[PDB]
Ligand binder design. Sequence first.
Ligand SMILES: O=C1CCN([C@@H]2O[C@H](COP(=O)(O)O)[C@@H](O)[C@H]2O)C(=O)N1
Ligand SMILES: O=C1CCN([C@@H]2O[C@H](COP(=O)(O)O)[C@@H](O)[C@H]2O)C(=O)N1
Lengths: 216, 221
Amino acid sequence: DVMNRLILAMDLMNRDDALRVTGEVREYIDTVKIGYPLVLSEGMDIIAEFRKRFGCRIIADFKVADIPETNEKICRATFKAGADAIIVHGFPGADSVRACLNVAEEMGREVFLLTEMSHPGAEMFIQGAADEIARMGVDLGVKNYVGPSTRPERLSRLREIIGQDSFLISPGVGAQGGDPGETLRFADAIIVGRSIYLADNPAAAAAGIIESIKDL
Amino acid sequence: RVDVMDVMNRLILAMDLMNRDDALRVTGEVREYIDTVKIGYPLVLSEGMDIIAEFRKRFGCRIIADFKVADIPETNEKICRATFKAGADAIIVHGFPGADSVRACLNVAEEMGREVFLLTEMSHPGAEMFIQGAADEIARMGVDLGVKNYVGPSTRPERLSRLREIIGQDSFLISPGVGAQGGDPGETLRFADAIIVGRSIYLADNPAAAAAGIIESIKDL
Ligand SMILES: O=C1CCN([C@@H]2O[C@H](COP(=O)(O)O)[C@@H](O)[C@H]2O)C(=O)N1
Ligand SMILES: O=C1CCN([C@@H]2O[C@H](COP(=O)(O)O)[C@@H](O)[C@H]2O)C(=O)N1
């Protein structure tokens, strides 16, 4: 359940800068996506400090993409550190995804499957496998997916493959060129980074996104 | 080649033990046999990125951060910069996300005077689903991008042979999957400049013995 269907992609690599901008929009968002830029620079503990400070949900955007054995250790360390869910790459195959799924089940946490990416290079290899990956996710029982806001038509095919009962979130809104509303037509929530945290006033920017989405 | 950074004994230790003391102890025990250590997320996420500078100072070993960077260009650059800032000598990047994603890593590597290793084909079974079908092209893309260091699968020597003929004799190839995953040090080293070995060594009763034994079976070839 994402407040305002808006998730913040906190990719500032500065703890102060990060905590500060995440406080300037906490009233608008209650779900934060934390990735390696911040975790590698400030440590895995930044996750508990984010929870303690903002009492927000944490999605670790780690794009796990290793062999099953290692994917298990990465997920375990990520959940131990307190992440509510972790985003996993599907291109490595079914056994690699099933590894994070097992650890998510064992620790009562969630796995989000990244099927298609939002950037241009994504066309070379990812795009053509996107559907088979989303399908693999269905066979595996994955209920949470991540799809490209930059390609509304693709984001739409993804939603018809995963079904209406699946939770779908989508990055690539704003900076990369995606439109909130058009994205929210198929996705449950949008992920927005630079458009908020690189803004003179993140509080406003965020608000502005919600104001053009209340009409939804 | 010779215009590349070699690895002592063609053996790279994959240190994936998840706690500082055991990692430091096991690595110290085999330090005599290797001079390149591959540190991944299992260790870094449990003990912090400072662990990279500590291994580097303590052992005088070169560090390869096996982070498999696989994000968009903008984020890949921040990940590589943080990794190099942490002191790593190289970083392993996935190729499946495309050329623009690899170039972002390469820009920061050459900017900071570090290396990038491109992961073309993976070594687990699931790697046959979508990565194997794109591997030759990912390798071709890396050669075109200027990539000189690659990572290929020990578990599939015929596939590793194809990689080597795609990247040529001057490129540097390292390969995982030897031991716990079933790969043999011999066949692999016919194509790869060096093997990456984790569990066969760090979970052995006696790590030093395990490492010396491998280096021996390699010695004759
Ligand atoms: O397909 C993907 C992979 C995940 N992401 C992640 O979503 C976030 C987007 O931030 P921006 O809104 O500034 O583009 C960023 O953390 C990025 O790494 C993608 O943008 N696209
Ligand atoms: O294709 C790949 C990706 C990198 N790796 C990495 O190589 C290391 C192998 O350790 P083992 O030797 O115990 O299998 C481990 O850290 C693993 O994550 C692969 O094994 N295969």
